[PDB]
C-alpha cells in the first residue's frame, strides 16, 4: 500500500476542500489548453469534468476552469513541470506540477527539498528509475479484494495492488480512458483516472528517523498548490505514523 494514502476515503470533504478544487480547477485548464475547449475531441477534459462533478465542486467552476484553459494566450500560463529529486536515504522523487510561474515553483519546490534534508535536482536525474503509466483508483468500500482483481484481469492490467480504502490499477499509459472505460462497463466505480509515473523499484529504508523526513517531504510538496502528483520509490516497514 505504499503510498495511496489518504488516510481513510478523501483526506477531507471540508477543511480541505478549496485545495483540493484548486488542483482539479488546474487539470480542466491543461486539459483544455492540451486538447481543446470541446470535451468531444478531448477525453482528458471529459475525464476532468468527471472528476470535478464528482467531488461536488460548483459547475460553474468546472465552465469558468474551461475558458481559463482555452481563452488562454495572454493572461494565464499554466503548464505541466516535472520536477525530479532526491529525499534522505536515498529515496527518489519525481513531482508533477501545473504552475503559471515556474521559477517561483521550482524555488517553493527547492525550498521544501532542502528543509526536509533532500534536494532538487535537474531534469533527468531520476526518470530513468520509473515508467509512465495510467493510473486507476477505485473505492475499496465499494467493491471487494475478489470481484475487482478479477475485473483488473479481465479488463487487461498492467498491475494491480488492493488498499485498505482505495484499490490502485496501473495501465499502458496509451491505453488509460480505454482501461477505465472497460472498467465503468463492468461496473466498477472510478475515484481517479490520470497518467502517473511508477517506480521500476524501491529503496528500502529502516532507518524510522529517515523515514519520518521522506515523509514530512512528500507531504510538503502535496501542501502547494502547484503540485499536483508526488512520486516516490521508498520502501517502509508498514508505518501509518505521520501523513
Not at 472528476?51 to 476552469?65: D, F, G, V
Not at 480504502?165 to 496509451?174: A, G, M
Amino acid at each position: 500500500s505504499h503510498w495511496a494514502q489518504i488516510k481513510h476515503k478523501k483526506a477531507k470533504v471540508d477543511a480541505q476542500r478549496g485545495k483540493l478544487f484548486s488542483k482539479l480547477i488546474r487539470e480542466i485548464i491543461v486539459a483544455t489548453r492540451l486538447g481543446g475547449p470541446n470535451p468531444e475531441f478531448n477525453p482528458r477534459l471529459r475525464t476532468a469534468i468527471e472528476q470535478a462533478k464528482k467531488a461536488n465542486m460548483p459547475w460553474e467552476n468546472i465552465e469558468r476552469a474551461i475558458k481559463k484553459g482555452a481563452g488562454e494566450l495572454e493572461g494565464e500560463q499554466f503548464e505541466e513541470v516535472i520536477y525530479e529529486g532526491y529525499a534522505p536515504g536515498g529515496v527518489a522523487v519525481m513531482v508533477l506540477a501545473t504552475t503559471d510561474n515556474r521559477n517561483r515553483t521550482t524555488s517553493e519546490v527547492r525550498h521544501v527539498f532542502t528543509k526536509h534534508g533532500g534536494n532538487l535536482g535537474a531534469s533527468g536525474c531520476v526518470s530513468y528509475l520509473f515508467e509512465r503509466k495510467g493510473y486507476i483508483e477505485v473505492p475499496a468500500k465499494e467493491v471487494s479484494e475478489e470481484e475487482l482483481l478479477e475485473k483488473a484481469i479481465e479488463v487487461g492490467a498492467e498491475d494491480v495492488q488492493p488498499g485498505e480504502e482505495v484499490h490502485i490499477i496501473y495501465t499502458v499509459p496509451e491505453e488509460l480512458y480505454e482501461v477505465k472505460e472497460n472498467l465503468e462497463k463492468l461496473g466498477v466505480p472510478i475515484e481517479k483516472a490520470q497518467i502517473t509515473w511508477k517506480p521500476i523499484s524501491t529503496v528500502q529504508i529502516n532507518d524510522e528517523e529517515t523515514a519520518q523526513k521522506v515523509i514530512k517531504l512528500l507531504n510538503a510538496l502535496e501542501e502547494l498548490d502547484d503540485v499536483q502528483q508526488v512520486i516516490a520509490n521508498f520502501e517502509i516497514p508498514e508505518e501509518i505514523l505521520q501523513k
